[PDB]
Amino acid sequence: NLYFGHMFFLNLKQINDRFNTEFITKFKEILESGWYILGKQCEKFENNFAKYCGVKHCIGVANGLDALRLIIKAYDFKENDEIIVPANTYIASILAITDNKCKPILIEPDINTYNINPDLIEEKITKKTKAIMVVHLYGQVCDMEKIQLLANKYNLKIIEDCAQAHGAIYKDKRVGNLGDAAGFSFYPGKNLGALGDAGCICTNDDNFASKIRALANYGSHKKYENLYTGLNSRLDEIQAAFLDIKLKYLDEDNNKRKNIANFYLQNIKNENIILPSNKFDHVWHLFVVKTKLRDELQHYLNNHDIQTIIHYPIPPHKQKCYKDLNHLKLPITENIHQEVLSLPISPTMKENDFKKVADILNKWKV
Amino acid sequence: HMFFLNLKQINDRFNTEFITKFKEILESGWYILGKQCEKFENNFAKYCGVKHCIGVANGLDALRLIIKAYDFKENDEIIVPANTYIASILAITDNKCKPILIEPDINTYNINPDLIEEKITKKTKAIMVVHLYGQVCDMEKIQLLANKYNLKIIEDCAQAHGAIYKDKRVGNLGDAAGFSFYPGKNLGALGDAGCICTNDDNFASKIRALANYGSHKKYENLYTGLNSRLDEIQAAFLDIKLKYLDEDNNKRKNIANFYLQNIKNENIILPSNKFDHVWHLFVVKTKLRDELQHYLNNHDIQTIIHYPIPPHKQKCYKDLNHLKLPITENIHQEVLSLPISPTMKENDFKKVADILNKWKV
Ligand SMILES: Cc1ncc(COP(=O)(O)O)c(/C=N/[C@@H]2[C@@H](O)[C@@H](OP(=O)(O)OP(=O)(O)OC[C@H]3O[C@@H](n4cc(C)c(=O)[nH]c4=O)C[C@@H]3O)O[C@H](C)[C@H]2O)c1O
Ligand SMILES: Cc1ncc(COP(=O)(O)O)c(/C=N/[C@@H]2[C@@H](O)[C@@H](OP(=O)(O)OP(=O)(O)OC[C@H]3O[C@@H](n4cc(C)c(=O)[nH]c4=O)C[C@@H]3O)O[C@H](C)[C@H]2O)c1O
Ligand SMILES: [Cl-]
Ligand code: NA
Structure with missing residues (x-):
């Protein structure tokens, strides 16, 4: 007890200490590989997280804000297109919308869930609405049924912000598989947290998944070529490995x-x-x-x-x-x-x- | 096969230290914006001869954030070499600025300074110089034009860590400088990584905020920012390598x-x-x-x-x-x-x- 009584809000040392041997083993494996970016660890974690969520595709990205920003960029909406979103979510949900020059349309939550009140969404739909971004706030899944019906009625995309709700279940599906595309944060404080910044996007759509990979890789699908004006938003090999270890629990x-x-x-x-x-x-x-x-x-x-x-x-x-x-x-x-x-x-x-x-x-x- | 860039051979020199520091970080329980980031930033700043170093997420982000911080208008013009890597240009267009592409000098592979002035217009707000392939660009005329025309000088230093021009290092040759520490760069991380360097206190503080969702203080957002941080682990690995x-x-x-x-x-x-x-x-x-x-x-x-x-x-x-x-x-x-x-x-x-x-x- 000779290294140096307050109860900390979130003791990450204690959460992660369970895995230290495994983290070190995997680190040394990565050193042996000589490959630190877009390698076998990313592939492995993607495959396992997709399976966990019940989706076809998972794309590792740099953080959960980027994951939302990438989704919205991939849809290529017009300037001032409207995205409906809960008013009481974390700011990064809204930053992802405004960074893409879309207009956030802020909806009150239900006082008894802290999640967007689905009954307040339709009245704010306009000819500019292109998507609804649901957020499963604090860990609790949104009541998705009416939201899915509405999306279908108005040909809207549903974007899930899953940053706080890893593995929650609505009826027969996991968060991440309740809309068109889903962003996650694996910031260290999250229920599945990396040891660095990290995120993903989940989706069942083959074209969307491909477009996201390119957009998160400078816009490059093929070495030397840039099909899109993209950004740099990748999940490090090291972090992918750490996440894969913890995902099993x-x-x-x-x-x-x-x-x-x-x-x-x-x-x-x-x-x-x-x-x-x-x-x-x-x-x-x-x-x-x-x-x-x-x-x-x-x-x-x-x-x-x-x-x-x-x-x-x-x-x-x-x-x-x-x-x-x-x-x-x-x-x-x-x-x-x-x-x-x-x-x-x-x-x-x-x-x-x-x-x-x-x-x-x-x-x-x- | 002889590899183009054998990063295992480059990094094997530091394995024991990398493992030690990784274990130290585990012991800390802190992985984001901690002591390793501070230490590396301080040492890299000293290395470049600048006042301020902000760890960010990668090279592209470094350049994007510098341009974002200046609050240019849509279609404002940034003069840049035509033959640079595409990420220099992506930083410009991501900010809805117009890249004004200038031919290099065949004898340097760097922007030809004599071809800049003719392309300056009322919309020009900046010159992005790139120190391509490792060689510092000839800044004398560029500095004169920036002064004359009230332009910012932004350095893309992603390929030229440590290069020297007169009494200064790349990173200290303009108003603000972006660096990549992608693993293949002369100072490479074991993951994506970057920084921004500058001497301006206010600019540096703004950049810190902008790379942290726009938050200077917990709970509050002054700006509409990004999340572009340098992980503790990567900062540690870079600080080890920086000494060499x-x-x-x-x-x-x-x-x-x-x-x-x-x-x-x-x-x-x-x-x-x-x-x-x-x-x-x-x-x-x-x-x-x-x-x-x-x-x-x-x-x-x-x-x-x-x-x-x-x-x-x-x-x-x-x-x-x-x-x-x-x-x-x-x-x-x-x-x-x-x-x-x-x-x-x-x-x-x-x-x-x-x-x-x-x-x-
Ligand atoms: C709905 C929604 N959408 C998008 C996003 C964007 O995702 P992102 O880009 O990945 O951040 C979020 C992020 N959401 C979180 C946000 O809720 C908030 O979380 P917070 O609990 O206020 O964050 P914190 O105080 O930094 O950490 C929580 C605890 O964990 C301890 N800790 C933390 C760290 C980093 C450590 O190294 N060691 C520790 O011991 C300290 C604290 O006790 O701010 C974070 C930076 C965001 O990632 C979100 O909630
Ligand atoms: C002027 C300028 N401005 C902005 C930027 C943007 O910086 P960034 O956002 O940090 O990428 C760059 C980046 N520039 C580089 C760019 O020059 C290009 O570099 P490249 O030499 O073609 O890249 P590479 O093929 O991935 O790796 C080179 C060698 O290293 C080996 N390798 C690589 C990795 C990642 C590994 O894990 N293990 C390995 O063994 C394989 C290769 O043989 O592509 C990179 C993705 C960019 O970061 C630039 O040059
Ligand atoms: Cl031959
Ligand atoms: Na990162």
Whole structure:
């Protein structure tokens, strides 16, 4: 104990320490190969992640923002084409739209799911709408049925932002296989997290998959040639290998998260706290509580040596980078942003720690 | 087979240190924007003689972010060499700027500075200089024009790590500079990697934000940015290798000298080094280029072309395909690169020179 009592929001050392021997073995394998980019590890991980999601194709890319940006670029929509998207998602969802010179059309979530309210989408469809981007926020899959029907009615693409929901299931399909194309983040904090920036795109469409590979490789499908004006967005061999190791435990890990979320849901009882009771399958990337006393709560937990993070306190429309959206009246989204706080959760989290989080919350008088 | 660029041989020198640092990073529990990135950035900045180094995700991203940060208007013009790698041009068009393509000097393979001014217009906002194949571009006139015309100078340093011009390094010859650390570059990562260098405090801070979703501070986005970061692991691997970069570049100098002193074949035009050349690519030029590549291949010598189709002739740039750039076009029809690397063995480079001398067409 001679190397150098605070409960960290997400202890990645502890999550990853289980795999250190394997990571090192695979690193040395890569060194032996002399190949660090677009190699056998990327191919292997792609194949395995496609199988996991139930899709035909997976393309490793540099991060989850790029994965969304690439999808939208591949569709080659006109300037100011409209993409419907939840108002309360992480900003990178919206950045991917505006970077492609599309107009985001911000929809309120359901207060009881934190995910886009499907019943509010149709009224905002216009002749410029080209896609709906669903986000499975915090880990909970969106109620996809009406959204799929609407996409079909209006000949819209469905783009899934799966950054927070790796392996969740709606009816008979995995997230990643509920629309036309899907972006994932494997940022280290995610349920399946790399040791660096990393992402993917999933799809069943052969042409789309091919076009994405070229677009993510300078626009080059063949050495020396550039069919498209592309970008550089690749998944390193090293990261692909690390992800493949962890992917073998991802269902087991997510079910362990479910066990801890269900402990919180059943054991936390405080009139000042609204618990995130799930309406659909939830893999609990984030365990988000809601209170009118949010900053007080975070200070209270900190005083009791529990670290928390807010996801999120400023919604995209109120950010300085989007002053042209600051006017929008989105009171549900705004309320959420004032009131949410995330509690520590992870698949390797200690019983004494989750028991403390619950007990400390129960004791909170505000 | 003799490989064009044997990266296993180059990187095997550092395996024990790479493994140590990887394990240190595991011990840290921090993989993004941590101590390794800071350390490498600080050392690379010192290496280039600049105030600020921002690790980013790759070379293309480096150039894209520099241009994004300047907030140019759609169709603003950026003067750039026509014969550079296509990613220099992709950075420009990604920002909805217009690449104004200038012929190189056949004696440097770099932008001909005497051909820049005639192409400057009210829309010109920048010159992108590229230090192609390892050789620094002649900046004197470029600096004068930038001053006269209120242009930014952006350096694409992806092929010329460490090259020197007068009292300065590439990276410190303009307003801001992009670097690739793709594994094949003179300083190569074990993955995709890049940086931006600059002396301007405000610009540097803006670039940091822009490469981090546009966020300077947790929770807040000042700008509509990208996610373009240099991983801790890659920063570590680069910082190990950086200590040997000048030495590695001198090793390439030695091989290039051997080629220059020993290849004697009337069918082959050899490269010169008017200004400092770190010899990322050793580029020969012949009317029988495909023939030569095939011949070398029959002799178990792998080569690559840099490059056979110029940016303006690419299908992605249809609207440029009509542009008449005969110097650039002729170069693309005639160049081939010979194997060169800091670790390349004597017997291997002697064979390349000998087989080239035997090419009797
Ligand atoms: C819906 C949606 N769409 C697109 C995206 C874009 O994907 P991306 O481009 O891959 O980021 C996201 C990203 N989403 C996340 C976003 O939710 C937010 O996550 P966060 O929990 O606030 O992030 P964090 O604080 O950096 O890390 C969480 C915890 O993990 C610990 N940690 C972290 C790191 C990096 C480490 O090395 N060591 C650690 O111990 C520290 C913290 O306790 O910001 C991230 C940078 C984004 O990737 C998204 O949610
Ligand atoms: C002027 C300028 N500006 C911007 C850029 C953009 O930088 P980037 O976004 O960081 O790529 C470049 C990149 N420029 C290079 C470009 O010159 C070209 O380089 P190349 O020599 O044709 O590339 P390569 O064939 O992939 O590798 C060279 C040799 O190295 C071996 N190798 C390679 C890898 C990756 C490996 O893992 N193991 C190996 O053994 C195989 C080959 O024999 O293509 C690259 C993808 C670009 O990064 C440029 O030159
Ligand atoms: Cl022969
Ligand atoms: Na990367």
